[PDB]
Design a protein around this nucleic acid. Structure first.
Ligand SMILES: N[C@@H](Cc1c[nH]c2ccccc12)C(=O)O
Ligand SMILES: [Mg+2]
Ligand SMILES: [Mg+2]
Ligand SMILES: [Mg+2]
Ligand SMILES: [Mg+2]
Ligand SMILES: [Mg+2]
Ligand SMILES: [Mg+2]
Ligand SMILES: [Mg+2]
Ligand SMILES: [Mg+2]
Ligand SMILES: [Mg+2]
Ligand SMILES: [Mg+2]
Ligand SMILES: [Mg+2]
Ligand SMILES: [Mg+2]
Ligand SMILES: [Mg+2]
Ligand SMILES: [Mg+2]
Ligand SMILES: [Mg+2]
Ligand SMILES: [Mg+2]
Ligand SMILES: [Mg+2]
Ligand SMILES: [Mg+2]
Ligand SMILES: [Mg+2]
Ligand SMILES: [Mg+2]
Ligand SMILES: [Mg+2]
Ligand SMILES: [Mg+2]
Ligand SMILES: [Mg+2]
Ligand SMILES: [Mg+2]
Ligand SMILES: [Mg+2]
Ligand SMILES: [Mg+2]
Ligand SMILES: [Mg+2]
Ligand SMILES: [Mg+2]
Ligand SMILES: [Mg+2]
Ligand SMILES: [Mg+2]
Ligand SMILES: [Mg+2]
Ligand SMILES: [Mg+2]
Ligand SMILES: [Mg+2]
Ligand SMILES: [Mg+2]
Ligand SMILES: [Mg+2]
Ligand SMILES: [Mg+2]
Ligand SMILES: [Mg+2]
Ligand SMILES: [Mg+2]
Ligand SMILES: [Mg+2]
Ligand SMILES: [Mg+2]
Ligand SMILES: [Mg+2]
Ligand SMILES: [Mg+2]
Ligand SMILES: [Mg+2]
Ligand SMILES: [Mg+2]
Ligand SMILES: [Mg+2]
Ligand SMILES: [Mg+2]
Ligand SMILES: [Mg+2]
Ligand SMILES: [Mg+2]
Ligand SMILES: [Mg+2]
Ligand SMILES: [Mg+2]
Ligand SMILES: [Mg+2]
Ligand SMILES: [Mg+2]
Ligand SMILES: [Mg+2]
Ligand SMILES: [Mg+2]
Ligand SMILES: [Mg+2]
Ligand SMILES: [Mg+2]
Ligand SMILES: [Mg+2]
Lengths: 46, 93, 271, 16
RNA sequence: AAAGCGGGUGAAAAGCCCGCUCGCCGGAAGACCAAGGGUUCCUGUCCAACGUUAAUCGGGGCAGGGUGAGUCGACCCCUAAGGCGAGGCCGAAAGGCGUAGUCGAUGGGAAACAGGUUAAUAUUCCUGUACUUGGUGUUACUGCGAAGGGGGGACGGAGAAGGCUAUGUUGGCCGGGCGACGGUUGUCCCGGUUUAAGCGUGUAGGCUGGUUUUCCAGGCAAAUCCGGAAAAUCAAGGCUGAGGCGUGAUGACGAGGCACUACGGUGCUGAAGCAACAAAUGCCCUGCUUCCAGGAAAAGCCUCUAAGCAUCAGGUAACAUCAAAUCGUACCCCAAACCGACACAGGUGGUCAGGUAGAGAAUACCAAGGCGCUUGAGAGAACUCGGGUGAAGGAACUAGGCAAAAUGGUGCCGUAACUUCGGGAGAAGGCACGCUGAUAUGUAGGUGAGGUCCCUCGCGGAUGGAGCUGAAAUCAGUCGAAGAUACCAGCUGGCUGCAACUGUUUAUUAAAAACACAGCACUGUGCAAACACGAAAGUGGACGUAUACGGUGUGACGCCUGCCCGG
RNA sequence: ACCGAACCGACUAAUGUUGAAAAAUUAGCGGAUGACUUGUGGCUGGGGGUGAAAGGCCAAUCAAACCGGGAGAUAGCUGGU
């Protein structure tokens, strides 16, 4: 059966990547929340 | 012109293996481990001016790191570049 | 011509098609073509603003001269062409100085004809004159609203606008809705009814033909659910409601025009 | 999650 | 889908290695990629844990090796949908839209093929032979120049045929064999009979009339370019183009034979290397014919000039030299490596497409190649699952012929009511079908050598039939219980409700009589349209203009659609 | 338009139901040049989208997604103490 995750690196990076996070104003808030928590990996790029 | 600073930095090490020895004894080719940010012209100039031999062409490839386990702690051996340098039939390092 | 299809399949049983042998068969004029992309009825917010639009064939836009501004130069009507963007046919016309244009084709115009625009042009179909020069009682099309703006009235196939009066600087036009409108006498108008009247006699014959023209299916509110349409709901077929649009405004008889800016120009409504 | 015979309707609604 | 045995290693072998059989797939369970993954690739060693058993094995642990590009792909130039958007318009703030621009492939843009090699890479390394773009420098001639004008790039669906090729079959030739059991020097048996890009010629086919003057309200200004107008003159001129042929190639490759082997594989040599026929869904073909539903954009490319430079720069043609950087390249890829928590009967886009029978990419058996599905050995109870057959009866079962059984192919004969004249219809129903010989040592048809003749002279035309291939039919004979013998492959008829029909729907208990539908009617709307999204600017409607668009209801077609305005 | 593979779907029956599978397998079944199907990319956002209309679908969740927050909502109710 076709499941919900059909992966693609290009769509992954355009959706959740660092440059899209910096592009939207609330994405920068997301990065602030993750840095304040102390995540090893902020976005899906690494 | 490529500076001697740059040449002495870009040549890193020789490479020893069965394939490297076969390349040396068959096609007059030396195999060199090279710093990653070195280009083909930089490797050619460095070999040509430091080993006092003459180079036909140079071929480069980036060797990927290896994921290793050290006591159930994951680590990642780093990348490097490898250069196959072809000599003009009469150098014989 | 109006030719009925033979019923060799259920879809082709009811088909009536209009075949025109005078139309060009080759490719249209590459200098005058343009692209247009289909929208699907979606505006810049991405929402469907007009329902039941989507799909269909790919089309190219033809730049059609509605202004008819090149006055004083006689022009030779070369050929008639199919425009997929409108009901009427276009005509590729060659002016005397070497420039080609697309115009609407009026009724009776054929290949190799003579047309001319301007204040001194003769009174014959295809010729563009200001309605101060156009005699009263005569049928025109491609009528302007503002001087130099371009034609906006009687542009579909088979339609025409009849000049009934001229009072000072304004002429009164009877429009195909039945409507009397005062427009400036300086506005241009091309003589003769628009061609392709037989366009109204077509029968599509099938839902496939509708989808080729690019209209998605229409769902009745009485078949919807109560949350979707003001008509929706009921065990079985129940209506019990006054007929309204999906946003709640009554749709049988309720007038919706409100333009006090042009109430001054409108003489009589379409009744 | 849940058993299919508990999600089913003919056997769950057995005594209405 | 299925295993058996012999040997090896080892503490121990149903599973590992090697061999001989047996079975399964073979439009895939074979080969190559894109997406995705990340070292799973190869070698050495180990069996704690992982592997639904054991393990000497592994996609496991550990260590070492491995991915070589001017030509493949990215990067790069150019745009689509769409994104962002200097100024700007708008909005309590945040922000919304949007012009110039600038990103964005799933598309357009230059160039490499054959052989060989490694345990693991190769259109990347080596051998041989090529090709492209750009910079520099000599030589010769010369009006060059764009952010601007023009051409081109540049485009749909279906269908039909011709020419071909990939490819296959047979013949010839070359090398080998004379058979465990009757026969096998013969019309016998096995195998091989391969060769590319590039360069030269320009054929089947396709398109278009060329050539030279003079003039012009057009192409934002100019133009020798495009368009338009008028003359003269010639009739073959141009463009495109598969395939073939020559060369590349006295080269490479080659069945085998000879010698070692760490028996895994290496080193040496090497004959024939052609013809006919059949033939693609591939190429000519981005073609031709036709239809309506009328079928991307921009750059690279060619061309014309403005400002400017004006014996300078710059351009064209030849030669020489230099440069083509950077990143990916292992391996899996219908799967044990991707998505499914699993070494999971699921899912996953493109490319290649052998033989026999067949209409066929179905199906049966096979080739190249890959597998026997990581628990086995016994026994042969009930019962459950998947099947096979069955006396007599034949729906008596049951809610209901549910299920199963049966019908099943080609050619011909024949076929009703009703009908919108198309249908119904494959109605129903019936007959023939294998093999051998003759007509005819293989026919009709297809292809077509040699020879001869002709010429605007070669990839040319006419004759001519060698040879190859090859239905279908009739007659005669013969075998069986049965000749569409397997696989594959309609059950048919009658009355009737509903919906005209093809379609869509409750992913995961509902596929319907519901939804849609073409058609019909009412109603709104004069364009700065009604209407919708949006505090607004804007945008869709639409680059449309009442023969158009929105809303509502009915639902092909035929005959119709009656009375009531009190609520 | 018709018959029929690829491909798309899902009408019937059996199996399975702590499954091989959180929707499949087997044998039959419907469409198969079109209102077809598919790859890559883009757009529409929660009282909102999209909907040939089933309250269907929006990441195994839909008569109002998921995540964090008001929040230790409230609970004349049940259990425990
Ligand atoms: N029992 C069936 C069907 C089923 C799945 N999920 C369900 C939930 C409810 C009822 C039935 C089901 C199965 O396991 O596949
Ligand atoms: Mg090289
Ligand atoms: Mg490289
Ligand atoms: Mg509508
Ligand atoms: Mg309708
Ligand atoms: Mg309903
Ligand atoms: Mg309501
Ligand atoms: Mg009722
Ligand atoms: Mg009532
Ligand atoms: Mg053994
Ligand atoms: Mg076994
Ligand atoms: Mg074996
Ligand atoms: Mg088999
Ligand atoms: Mg590992
Ligand atoms: Mg391995
Ligand atoms: Mg042990
Ligand atoms: Mg074990
Ligand atoms: Mg391993
Ligand atoms: Mg844009
Ligand atoms: Mg700004
Ligand atoms: Mg914007
Ligand atoms: Mg760009
Ligand atoms: Mg691309
Ligand atoms: Mg390999
Ligand atoms: Mg051939
Ligand atoms: Mg085809
Ligand atoms: Mg590979
Ligand atoms: Mg297994
Ligand atoms: Mg699997
Ligand atoms: Mg598939
Ligand atoms: Mg098969
Ligand atoms: Mg038994
Ligand atoms: Mg049984
Ligand atoms: Mg049986
Ligand atoms: Mg019986
Ligand atoms: Mg019997
Ligand atoms: Mg009987
Ligand atoms: Mg009974
Ligand atoms: Mg009974
Ligand atoms: Mg049955
Ligand atoms: Mg059966
Ligand atoms: Mg016979
Ligand atoms: Mg009844
Ligand atoms: Mg129906
Ligand atoms: Mg369902
Ligand atoms: Mg109805
Ligand atoms: Mg009535
Ligand atoms: Mg059909
Ligand atoms: Mg479905
Ligand atoms: Mg169902
Ligand atoms: Mg099935
Ligand atoms: Mg059908
Ligand atoms: Mg079918
Ligand atoms: Mg309901
Ligand atoms: Mg869901
Ligand atoms: Mg709510
Ligand atoms: Mg509170
Ligand atoms: Mg609480």
């Amino acid at each position: 059966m076709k499941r919900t995750f059909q992966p693609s690196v290009l769509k992954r990076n355009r959706s959740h990547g660092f440059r899209a996070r910096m592009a939207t104003k609330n994405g920068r808030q997301v990065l602030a929340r993750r840095r304040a928590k102390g995540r090893a990996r902020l976005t899906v790029s690494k | 012109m490529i500076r001697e600073e740059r040449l002495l930095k870009v040549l890193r090490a020789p490479h020893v293996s069965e394939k490297a020895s076969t390349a040396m004894e068959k096609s007059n080719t030396i195999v060199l481990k090279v710093a990653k940010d070195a280009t083909k012209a930089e490797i050619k100039a460095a070999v040509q001016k430091l080993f006092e031999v003459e180079v036909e062409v140079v071929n480069t490839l980036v060797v990927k790191g290896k994921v290793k386990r050290h006591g159930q702690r994951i680590g990642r051996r780093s990348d490097w570049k490898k250069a196959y340098v072809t000599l003009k039939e009469g150098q014989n390092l | 011509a109006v030719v009925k299809c033979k019923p060799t399949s259920p879809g082709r049983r009811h088909v009536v098609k209009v075949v025109n042998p005078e139309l060009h068969k080759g490719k249209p004029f590459a200098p005058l073509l343009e692209k247009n992309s289909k929208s699907g009825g979606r505006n810049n917010n991405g929402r469907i603003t007009t329902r039941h639009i989507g799909g269909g064939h790919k089309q190219a836009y033809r730049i059609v001269d509605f202004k008819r501004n090149k006055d004083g130069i006689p022009a030779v009507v070369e050929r008639l062409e199919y425009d997929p963007n409108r009901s009427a046919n276009i005509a590729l016309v060659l002016y005397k100085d070497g420039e080609r244009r697309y115009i609407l084709a009026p009724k009776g115009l054929k290949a190799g004809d003579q047309i001319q625009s301007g204040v001194d042009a003769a009174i014959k179909p295809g010729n563009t004159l200001p309605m101060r020069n156009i005699p009263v009682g005569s049928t025109v099309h491609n009528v302007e609203m503002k001087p130099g703006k371009g034609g906006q009235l009687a542009r579909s196939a088979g339609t025409y606008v009849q000049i009934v009066a001229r009072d000072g600087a304004y002429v009164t036009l009877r429009l195909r809705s039945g409507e009397m409108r005062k427009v400036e006498a300086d506005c241009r108008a091309t003589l003769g009814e628009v061609g392709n009247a037989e366009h109204m006699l077509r029968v599509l014959g099938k839902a496939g033909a509708a989808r080729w023209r690019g209209v998605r299916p229409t769902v009745r509110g009485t078949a919807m659910n109560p949350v979707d349409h003001p008509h929706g709901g009921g065990e079985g077929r129940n209506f019990g409601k006054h007929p309204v649009t999906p946003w709640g405004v009554q749709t049988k008889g309720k007038k919706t025009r409100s333009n006090k800016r042009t109430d001054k120009f409108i003489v009589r409504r379409r009744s | 999650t849940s058993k299919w015979f508990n999600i089913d309707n003919k056997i769950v609604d057995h005594r209405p």
